[PDB]
């Protein structure tokens, strides 16, 4: 089997991407944030504290003939941005782009933090990291991908995120028309539960390539590119007037700037992030100070190849017995 679904930016900055997901019988379609940096499929629901729902579409398990309470199971998750959610668990039928999993754990939120409430466009998350990170207790649950894997034509999914435009998540096949040149594959460590890999270096603009190992995670659920302070300083030094602002919470730059590209290495291959992808617009409405899309990972404890990086590539998440990651230009 295979699946193919379009993923759409939630706003004009590509802050996140939503993908429609069918849950239950009859189908209830919710727009979920596919997150290769976590492993829980959770939704706003009829059980979510009413004051914490503000515009989201909810899953109502009592209206699904295939929903079953997973008795005794609870979940609770905290994300790198300080947001969080928790609740109980149902199993139900879940379909993405025509690919169906029966008995998928659907984690129903009883509580969500303010960041989730305030984002009317995201109805929940669909985790695509390794199932070892799933938070369901006392019986850990599998991701949608883990459940689908044996049925797929090939044990893979691909992320093809757009810049200010829709893109595609495919399951079970590689669309050879969706990228240019060849796909370069690179080793993955699953030791921390992430799609963790090592970039071979970087370049800023038209500058020379610096060969240096950068360990990090491929994370569709993180907006920006978070890299070591040395690398980030070298990038922003090429932008007149750019500076790290403790008050804003990162590097800012004059909105009048033209940003240089940023290249990262995948083996001997190179992925080029155009300068415009690194612009996250005014820090507040009407400001001439703009927020940068490349930020320091110092104090996160891990480097994160988030959407800024991933949207410059066609990315293969290969879930074979020994997982790997593939990157192609597009």
């Amino acid at each position: 089997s295979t699946g193919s679904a379009t993923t759409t930016p939630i706003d004009s900055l590509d802050d996140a991407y939503i993908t429609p997901v069918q849950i239950g019988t009859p189908a209830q379609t919710l727009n979920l944030d596919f997150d290769t940096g976590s492993s829980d499929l959770w939704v706003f629901s009829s059980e979510t504290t009413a004051s914490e729902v503000d515009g989201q579409t909810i899953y109502t398990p009592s209206k699904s003939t295939t929903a079953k309470l997973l008795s005794g199971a609870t979940w609770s998750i905290s994300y790198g941005d300080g947001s969080s959610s928790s609740g109980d668990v149902y199993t139900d039928t879940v379909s993405v782009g025509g690919l169906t999993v029966t008995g998928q754990a659907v984690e129903s939120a009883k509580k969500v933090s303010s960041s989730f409430t305030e984002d009317s466009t995201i109805d929940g998350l669909l985790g695509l990291a390794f199932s070892t990170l799933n938070t369901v207790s006392p019986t850990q649950q599998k991701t949608f991908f883990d459940n689908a894997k044996a049925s797929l034509d090939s044990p893979v999914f691909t992320a093809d995120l757009g810049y200010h435009a829709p893109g595609t998540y495919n399951f079970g096949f590689i669309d050879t028309t969706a990228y240019t040149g060849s796909i370069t594959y690179t080793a993955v460590s699953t030791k921390q539960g992430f799609w963790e890999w090592t970039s071979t270096g970087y370049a800023v603009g038209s500058g020379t390539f610096k060969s240096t190992s950068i360990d990090g995670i491929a994370d569709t659920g993180t907006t920006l590119l978070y890299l070591p302070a040395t690398v980030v300083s070298a990038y922003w030094a090429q932008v007149s007037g750019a500076k790290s602002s403790s008050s804003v919470g990162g590097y800012v730059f004059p909105c009048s700037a033209t940003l240089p590209s940023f290249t990262f290495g995948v083996g001997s291959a190179r992925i080029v992030i155009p300068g415009d992808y690194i612009d996250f617009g005014p820090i507040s409405t009407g400001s001439s100070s703009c927020f940068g899309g490349i930020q320091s990972s110092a104090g996160i404890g891990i480097n994160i190849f988030g959407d800024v990086a991933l949207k410059a590539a066609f990315v293969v998440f290969n879930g074979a017995t020994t997982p790997t990651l593939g990157f192609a230009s597009k």
Side-chain angles (χ1 to χ4, degrees), residues 1-62 64-67 69-109 112-141 143-148 150-190 192-242 244-330:
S1 62
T2 64
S4 181
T6 299
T7 192
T8 301
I10 65 164
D11 63 23
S12 62
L13 299 177
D14 298 346
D15 281 316
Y17 297 78
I18 52 174
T19 308
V21 178
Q22 282 73 48
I23 309 175
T25 310
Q28 300 181 38
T29 299
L30 274 65
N31 295 330
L32 306 186
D33 183 352
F34 283 24
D35 180 15
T36 63
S38 68
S39 305
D40 288 50
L41 192 176
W42 74 260
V43 297
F44 278 79
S45 76
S46 56
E47 300 178 329
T48 310
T49 300
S51 66
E52 297 179 349
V53 185
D54 189 3
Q56 295 81 7
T57 296
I58 63 166
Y59 169 57
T60 303
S62 67
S64 172
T65 58
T66 41
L69 181 70
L70 187 61
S71 182
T74 59
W75 63 280
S76 182
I77 192 162
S78 305
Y79 297 100
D81 66 349
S83 69
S84 67
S85 53
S86 64
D88 54 20
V89 188
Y90 293 82
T91 56
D92 208 340
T93 303
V94 172
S95 302
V96 176
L99 169 65
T100 302
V101 168
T102 57
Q104 174 64 47
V106 176
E107 300 173 36
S108 168
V112 303
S113 62
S114 58
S115 170
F116 287 115
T117 299
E118 291 163 1
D119 186 3
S120 65
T121 68
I122 292 177
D123 302 323
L125 266 65
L126 189 149
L128 292 168
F130 293 89
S131 293
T132 54
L133 294 181
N134 176 266
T135 77
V136 177
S137 178
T139 307
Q140 188 173 63
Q141 301 295 302
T143 71
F144 176 80
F145 178 55
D146 206 343
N147 282 322
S151 303
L152 295 176
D153 291 357
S154 182
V156 305
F157 67 91
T158 64
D160 180 9
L161 302 179
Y163 167 67
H164 292 352
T168 305
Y169 282 102
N170 290 330
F171 293 81
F173 73 105
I174 287 158
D175 179 359
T176 60
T177 74
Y179 57 88
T180 62
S182 50
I183 305 175
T184 296
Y185 291 86
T186 196
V188 164
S189 173
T190 64
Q192 295 181 16
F194 299 120
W195 293 91
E196 187 172 359
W197 64 290
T198 303
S199 172
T200 49
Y202 70 99
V204 176
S206 60
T208 60
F209 187 84
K210 177 68 171 184
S211 293
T212 184
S213 295
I214 305 171
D215 294 342
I217 66 168
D219 185 1
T220 58
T222 290
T223 312
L224 307 184
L225 174 52
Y226 294 90
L227 291 173
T230 48
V231 177
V232 176
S233 182
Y235 179 80
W236 290 108
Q238 297 304 309
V239 179
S240 297
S244 182
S245 166
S246 53
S247 62
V248 174
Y251 281 90
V252 296
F253 67 94
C255 294
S256 59
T258 299
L259 296 177
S261 64
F262 184 89
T263 299
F264 64 94
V266 183
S268 54
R270 307 287 180 255
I271 300 294
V272 180
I273 305 171
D276 293 344
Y277 290 27
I278 298 161
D279 176 20
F280 281 74
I283 61 170
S284 291
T285 302
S287 181
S288 71
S289 182
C290 274
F291 197 67
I294 296 177
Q295 296 294 345
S296 178
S297 63
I300 294 177
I302 200 158
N303 301 306
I304 307 173
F305 294 86
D307 297 334
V308 164
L310 303 182
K311 75 189 173 196
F314 177 87
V315 188
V316 182
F317 295 79
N318 170 25
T321 303
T322 297
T324 64
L325 275 168
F327 292 83
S329 295
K330 67 187 184 190

